[PDB]
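Standup notes
- HV: blocked on the assembly model, inputs below
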Amino acid sequence: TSVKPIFSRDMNEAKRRVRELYRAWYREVPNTVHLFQLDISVKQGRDKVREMFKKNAHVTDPRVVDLLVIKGKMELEETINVWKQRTHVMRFFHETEAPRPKDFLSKFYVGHDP
Amino acid sequence: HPGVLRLVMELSGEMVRKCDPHIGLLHRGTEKLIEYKTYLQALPYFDRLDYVSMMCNEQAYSLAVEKLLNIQPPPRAQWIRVLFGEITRLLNHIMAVTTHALDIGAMTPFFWMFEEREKMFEFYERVSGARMHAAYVRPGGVHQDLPLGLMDDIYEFSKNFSLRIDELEEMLTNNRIWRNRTVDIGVVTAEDALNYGFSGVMLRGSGIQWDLRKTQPYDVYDQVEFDVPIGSRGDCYDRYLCRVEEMRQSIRIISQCLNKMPPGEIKVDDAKVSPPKRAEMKTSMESLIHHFKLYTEGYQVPPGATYTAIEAPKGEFGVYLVSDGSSRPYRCKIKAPGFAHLAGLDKMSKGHMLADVVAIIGTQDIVFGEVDR
Amino acid sequence: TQLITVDEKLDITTLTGVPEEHIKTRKARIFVPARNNMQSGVNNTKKWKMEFDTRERWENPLMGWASTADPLSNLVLTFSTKEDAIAFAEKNGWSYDVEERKVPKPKSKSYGANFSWNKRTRVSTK
Amino acid sequence: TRPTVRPRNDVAHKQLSAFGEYVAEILPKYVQQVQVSCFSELEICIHPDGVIPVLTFLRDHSNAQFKSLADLTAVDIPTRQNRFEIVYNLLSLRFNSRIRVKTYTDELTPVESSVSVYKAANWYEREIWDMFGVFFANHPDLRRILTDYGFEGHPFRKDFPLSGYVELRYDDEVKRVVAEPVELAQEFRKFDLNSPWEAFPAYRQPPE
Amino acid sequence: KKTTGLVGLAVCETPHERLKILYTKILDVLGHIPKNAAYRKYTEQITNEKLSIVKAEPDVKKLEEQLQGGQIEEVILQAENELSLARKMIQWKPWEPLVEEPPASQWKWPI
Amino acid sequence: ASATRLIQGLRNWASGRDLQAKLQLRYQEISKRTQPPPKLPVGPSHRLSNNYYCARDGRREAMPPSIVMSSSEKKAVSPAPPIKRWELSQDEPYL
Amino acid sequence: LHHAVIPHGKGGRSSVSGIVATVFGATGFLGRYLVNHLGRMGSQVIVPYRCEPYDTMHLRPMGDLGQIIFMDWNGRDKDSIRRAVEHSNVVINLVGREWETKNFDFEDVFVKIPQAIAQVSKEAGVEKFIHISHLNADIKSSSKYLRNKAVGEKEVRETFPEATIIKPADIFGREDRFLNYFANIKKTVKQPVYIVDVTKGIINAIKDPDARGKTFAFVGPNRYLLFDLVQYVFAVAHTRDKVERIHTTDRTLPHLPGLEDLGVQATPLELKAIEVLRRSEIEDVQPA
Amino acid sequence: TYKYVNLREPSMDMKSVTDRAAQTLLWTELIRGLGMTLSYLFREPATINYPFEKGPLSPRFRGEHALRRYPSGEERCIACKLCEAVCPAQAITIEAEPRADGSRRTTRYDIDMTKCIYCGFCQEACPVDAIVEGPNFEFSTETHEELLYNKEKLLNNGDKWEAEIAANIQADYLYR
Amino acid sequence: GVRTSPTGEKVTHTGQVYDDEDYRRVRFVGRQKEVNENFAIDLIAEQPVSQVGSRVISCDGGGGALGHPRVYINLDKETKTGTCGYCGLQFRQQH
Amino acid sequence: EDNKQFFGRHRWVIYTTEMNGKNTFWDVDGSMVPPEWHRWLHCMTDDP
Ligand SMILES: NC(=O)C1=CN([C@@H]2O[C@H](COP(=O)(O)OP(=O)(O)OC[C@H]3O[C@@H](n4cnc5c(N)ncnc54)[C@H](OP(=O)(O)O)[C@@H]3O)[C@@H](O)[C@H]2O)C=CC1
Ligand code: SF4
Ligand code: SF4
Ligand SMILES: [Zn+2]
């Protein structure tokens, strides 16, 4: 069962890393949203960032949590650079619906999509 | 437009700081597609991952599969394959020379040597029937051999091409400001030549007496007679001179190949690997069956993980094959000499300005479709 | 060197980048493929193939093709034992249906009882 | 048996066999398998802890130099608890031979960042990180090469299908090129070619 | 000599005595190792063989061609990196017995 | 070619390479098309009475890669003999 | 019905949706955005263009292969129009010009065009005849343009009455006309709604039958003064019948079905104002 | 086997050093380069009159993807699916049905001219040489949809010529 | 032998001709529906039937390694003609 | 076909006007030579 982890000794260092990373994401919003010449309010993007953080909330093993910290760290590197353009920043947004809700009936009309 | 790359240069003014090549923009997923196909369909990918070396990588992939598959190719196919390796090396060196020359300046010699290369394109047409992506090479012998009435024209082309390359040395080559442009750019330590994984032409132009041909003759390269040039400075001017003498030794090998051609055979003596000729293919049952199941299923391949590498005109062209017992390759991988040469770009262009960075990118031959793997 | 490790399931399913629509919607099926009964080859056995369920493949209205909105309808994974299949499916998260491997039956045949004296086994022509 | 069959030799076979046995003797700590190919290219199957001792031993030691670093990819194989394979290829400069260090690993447990011994390792390492997902211990820079910046999923894996989940197209509504889910016009007809009857009986694994 | 073939390589004046005192430090650092490690035996064997080549060769080019490793400072860098691996293999204990086994069904290749 | 000799003297004076003989553009130098129809012999098989495929079966000769263990000795050998230091070939050397 | 019309799978990029739409005009603003929404939905668009093929050629790739078809027409002949509506499922008409020409008035394009195309629509036996118009286009005075459009409304209700006469307010967008007149250089009630609300309402009404016979009018969600709009467009940003229409009035008519009968969320001013106001001082007066 | 260059000294005699000084300060060999360029300027160039002259080619050139048929006979194909089996982009799509006359036929023969990498594999795989790599290279299509050939499209393509194709086959059936 | 659909456009030898309600009719507006004018059904009706008095006869289709390979068809039946699967041209017997 | 010029200026062609109603005195096209002249003029032979 002896498996080497990435960084941490319990989930406490993992929580430390991910909340420091989210603080960097929160302070990283206004400069880039003024620089990228965007059209979406700061509240909407910040709520989508915290909602994406809350999407992966069902993970308890600290190796995976530190790996997601490394993922978001690379993401915040490529957004503190001006490497990523308007395309990927809007690609985080989902404006191309695809309107299908979780109704059984809307799945009945547009069939074969359970 | 500053090959297409993205470059992020941190600099102090006209005397830099750092440089970051963003590459991979010409990515095509050839590894994944070969993982979903057959060998005979994977072969155009190995024709065009490097596209200037149209037949050398053909030779490398074919001899990779034949090295795996315990098949000696027939002798006349070996001589034809060495002939087109020399021809393809000549074309690749001359296009790298002309694109570096046009990247700095130098209008007309570019077009002189591209007229030469148009004669080369007509030669590829008259041999294969393609224009640039001549498949022409099966693992299991060179397929669809050359027609009659060509070799004396190749002889005339060899004389006039020796004259034109001597006239390129006349026009350029002790030009004043071209030399003054290229002396102090491209310096590579021999320890750095080893540790930074540079291959072929950089190892030629700096330091080690090395050749994959001379170390491992996998073909009739041992029997033909020549001598490789070595650089010693490295001093990109001298690397250019090494390229020119490699071209001239390739012309000598062309002369020895014209002198030493046996009229033996086209492909191997195996209709289980090579799809046989038309009279026996039609008019015979066994060849029809082997033809049919050979094109449908693909030829069976024994399992294992192999590797080979040839001396492509860019350098150590490596190919690593992984194959289950099947007619599909399990996983292929390509070691690119252009990617290897690009891997030390900080230590090359550390101490110059941006135009010299452009000249360093030019003086290492590149396609960025092989560099992409 | 015998570090922190905690023992659970694995969480590669958040890492593999496929959305939860195709996680919970599509379902995997793990079986040993059939002997192609026209031929007689059991060489296509000994391979636990993992597949998915096929979905809609409508007609291309200009060309008449199999126009499908299915990225995951063209995968097959080769496994050695059923344990590897179960560990892989629980590793990457989506649901699995494992069928049981059905081997052939070693059946007794004998030329003498084919051509015996008072039994009903008599081919009468060969 | 004589004509048109690829000639091999016992000389390079015996040399590489004795050398691999010699290396396995002088490093009893991480060697597992020393397999000599019939076409004389050595493979050595290795545990993933003393990778940097192995590389410092194989850069040097004056009986075989091997100053040339080459192909390395952790070739995607399922069915194994230790999936990925780090195969460092080493080519000599004085002795003209090719050895492969195939050390094993799984997905999560990291290998130990071979850039400390070889200068040409860095872009290879960053490539394997973006493509497979093999993490490194005290590594300088993990960025994304050969992929899109917004793309995820480590697409070389057998987890990843042929197509992606993104499809770029421009619209004038929101005035940019957006990524939509996939809309394939052609099936990608997967022509199954695995015919029976066991062409190579010598490579048959023993059944139950 | 004068302006040898290799690029990043400036020759010295006495490879003889410098290489001899390097090999004395090689034998001493090797003396910091237990005997039962046969690594000591193989290194000491090849080092004494090359040292006995060195101890009776006055000429330079004759040494470069009789003793292999052409031409000269490749042997010097070879000895330096041999000392580097000696210093690193005080650590890491490469002659130890086995670390824990692989699952042993992995390396069966056709799978 | 097909021009006056005065500009021929100009071309030979600006670059003394005898441009009339060697001019890189061919007029009737072409080995002409429509060859005789070729007749091709098969190589060293289809030769009857001898060539079993069991004789020429290189595909089945592939042994599995041989296995070595770890899963007062004249020793410490190299993977190869040392390669000879090369030579200036006589084909126009330097210096 | 016959096959190859029923929907299949998702939408967009040569998807098989349910509809086949013949659009009249479409070179300008709203028809081009509606072609883009149909390519987003993945239907087949029949567009006849009378202009140079360069325009339809650079708006060509908005769909996938097979998703579009181009043809040629004149605004005088019923034969080309009947050839356009040979096999047509639904049909929309978008028409409107800022100044008259030497060959066309505001009348007889708004009269002679919807008479002819509504005629061949009712003869072809199609559904969801959707004809656009303008808000408060009276039969009565103050605008030749609006009274001609009201005559067009009356004639569309006249021939084939099972239709959708659809009027928005003065809509704004990326290529708006009147706001471009405002930027590049009295009392007025006005409430502009943004273009995507209108065209989402159109695609909802054209994928939702039972809509035949009902007329629509769209509402801006703010209802404020034109002078404060000028204040805002210069705060950020740092013909005669056209200016008389935008200084006339723009009121609400709650007696015909509008927005929430269709069930669509309206979009505000400031978001799309910050969008198009390229090349934060938000007034937001909104009187009632 | 190594032949290295640039290892030669400049001579420290007054002669060669002032000859190199004359080269440096007097612009000699640059004018020699001018003379080389003028020597090639007074040539006659190797161009072609493009709408009137068409350059050299091969008898094995792989263009049009046209069909053949039998001498006073039926359609040459079989629908044996070898070309679809070997096409490296799956650009071939053959939906096949037999007609009631007994001779086996098709329904829909499909070549994606977008997806064709122009091998020759479908030529070398067809047993009757139904699909033939064509001789001429003039497609230049204005529209996207017209690059999707159908069966009767290829039949009318083969109905314009065969004698060119038969000449290339008659010159090229012996080397393969 | 092209016919005419009740819609008006030409039929194909493959029976895929349109209905009164198809919209590929309306995508064919303005341009040619490129149909073939050569029907291989009736060209075989143009072909005469050979009379060969032997028992088992060959077929190649006019050329050594040109056309379809050697297929040997049978003529032992009295009334059912020998039809080549490759040629499609029948044969008779003279006994 | 001239025997004076080099390889590439052996054969050339002069078309006519309105062979299918094009007013093609100016701006002539390709795809106009019948294919026996495609065999001739592309130098796939040495025969007229
Ligand atoms: N706030 C707004 O902008 C409002 C807009 N509208 C409607 O929005 C649509 C787009 O408006 P806008 O972009 O400003 O104007 P456009 O002229 O650009 O759009 C009208 C479309 O119909 C075509 N068309 C109009 N008149 C004729 C004619 N006489 N002959 C042939 N074609 C004609 C146009 O040009 P072409 O022929 O070249 O295709 C174009 O395709 C119009 O239908 C207009 O009535 C209505 C009310 C308010
Ligand atoms: S290979 Fe030839 S006969 Fe077979 S399906 Fe293709 S075109 Fe038809
Ligand atoms: S030449 Fe074209 S159609 Fe033929 S096999 Fe190659 S890609 Fe397919
Ligand atoms: Zn026949």
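- HV (later): unblocked. Residues H 86-89, 91-92, 111, 116-122 surround iron/sulfur cluster (ligand 3) (CB under 6 Å). Chain D touches chain G through eleven residues (CB under 8 Å).
- Next: hand off to the docking folks.
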